[PDB]
Protein: Cytoplasmic dynein 1 heavy chain 1,Serine--tRNA ligase
Amino acid sequence: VKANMLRTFSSIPVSRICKSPNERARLYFLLAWFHAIIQERLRYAPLGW
Structure:
C-alpha cells in the first residue's frame, strides 16, 4: 500500500493537488488510499474481489 500510494502521489501534479481549497489535499489523500486498498486487494483473487 505504501509503494502504491507513493506512486499515485507522484503521478498527480502538485499544482492540481495543492493550489485549491485547503480541504482538497485530504480528499486526494483519501482517494489515493482507497485506490491503493482496492488495487492491492486484487492480489488475493478469490478472497478479495
Observations:
- The chain is about 65% helix and 0% strand.
- The helical segments are 2-11, 14-18, 24-40.
- The CA atoms of residues 41 and 48 lie 6 Å apart.
- The two ends are 16 Å apart (CA to CA).
